[PDB]
């Protein structure tokens, strides 16, 4: 596709785990785009505690909020989770490509709109539902993510307990307490990895 063309003019960089791509406050001039790898986007306080806004999978764009307003600062940290294959594109050259071909936006707008779908749902559940429904509707959809293994009447996920406190942004010990109370609910069959029946 366009991928290999653009790869000829190689901006594609390969980053290992945890090399910091984005600090916030940086200058916004370069779009990236993903070939391969997984990455977490996150934010923290002046006094240190950090928050994972989300994570992102292959095929998606980075940093898109900057192109519109010339000279913005980068909004959040985006810290490599694993080995990443990463495009890099200038806002100038990106606008050029916009004047060349906008059908790319046909695909792009869709994932953006469902980002709204999920972010509204984020703030909504933050308001309406306690930790119960919080991690309930976490694992219910964790049962649906590819890398999910089948459990005959159920589903298996082995993401054991560290990524979870990040994908929801919570303590793991409290996740413990209530995993065991959901085990008490006959909801979850879990021993590290969990069997969403």
Ligand X SMILES: Nc1ncnc2c1ncn2[C@@H]1O[C@@H]2COP(=O)(O)O[C@H]2[C@H]1O
Shortest distance in whole angstroms from residue 176 CB to DNA: 3
Draw the binding track, 24-53, toward DNA (x: CB under 7 A; -: no contact): ------------------------------
Does 48 count as an annotated binding residue? yes
Does 49 count as an annotated binding residue? yes
CA–CA dist 34, 104 (Å, integer): 14
Draw the binding track, 155-174, toward ligand X (x: CB under 6 A; -: no contact): --------------------
Does 165 count as an annotated binding residue? yes
Question: Which residues, at least 6 apart from 4, have a Cβ–Cβ distance to it below 8 Å?
Answer: none
Q: Which helix (H) or strand (E) holds 189?
A: strand 188-191
Q: Does 65 bind ligand X (CB under 6 A)?
A: yes
Maximum alpha-carbon separation in the chain:
59
CA–CA dist 171, 109 (Å, integer): 33
Angle, in degrees to the nearest 10, between helices 103-128 and 131-142: 150
Q: Does 161 bind DNA (CB under 7 A)?
A: yes
CA–CA dist 79, 83 (Å, integer): 11
Does 8 count as an annotated binding residue? no
Does 10 count as an annotated binding residue? no
Q: Does 134 bind DNA (CB under 7 A)?
A: no
Site for DNA, residues 176 to 195, rule: CB under 7 A? 176
Q: Does 76 bind ligand X (CB under 6 A)?
A: yes
**How are strands ordered across the β-sheet holding 39-44?**
20-22, 77-80, 39-44, 50-56
Query: 91 or 164, CB closer to ligand X?
Result: 91
CA angle 96, 58, 78 (to 5 degrees): 80
CA–CA dist 190, 160 (Å, integer): 10
Does 64 count as an annotated binding residue? yes
End-to-end C-alpha distance for the chain, whole angstroms: 41
Query: 57 or 132, CB closer to ligand X?
Result: 57
- Residue 54 binds which entry of ligand X, DNA, none, with Cβ cut-offs from 5 to 8 Å by kind? ligand X
Residues marked as binding for 3',5'-cyclic AMP?
48-54, 63-65, 74-75, 119-120, 127-128, 162-172
Residues at the interface with ligand X (CB under 6 A): 22, 28, 41, 53-54, 62-66, 74-76, 78, 115, 119
């Amino acid at each position: 596709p366009t991928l290999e063309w653009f790869l000829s003019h190689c901006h594609i960089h390969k980053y290992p785990s945890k090399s910091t791509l984005i600090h916030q406050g940086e200058k916004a001039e370069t779009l990236y785009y993903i070939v391969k790898g997984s990455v977490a986007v996150l934010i923290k306080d002046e006094e240190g505690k950090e928050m994972i806004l989300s994570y992102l999978n292959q095929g998606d764009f980075i940093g898109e909020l900057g192109l519109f307003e010339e000279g913005q600062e980068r909004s959040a940290w985006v810290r490599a989770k694993t080995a990443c294959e990463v495009a890099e594109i200038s806002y100038k050259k990106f606008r050029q490509l916009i004047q060349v071909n906008p059908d790319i936006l046909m695909r792009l707008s869709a994932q953006m709109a469902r980002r709204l779908q999920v972010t509204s749902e984020k703030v909504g559940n933050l308001a309406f539902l306690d930790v119960t429904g919080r991690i309930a509707q976490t694992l219910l959809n964790l049962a649906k993510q590819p890398d999910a293994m089948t459990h005959p009447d159920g589903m298996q996920i082995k993401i054991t307990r560290q990524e979870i406190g990040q994908i929801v942004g919570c303590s793991r010990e409290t996740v413990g307490r209530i995993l065991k109370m959901l085990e008490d609910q006959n909801l979850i069959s879990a021993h590290g990895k969990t069997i969403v029946v």
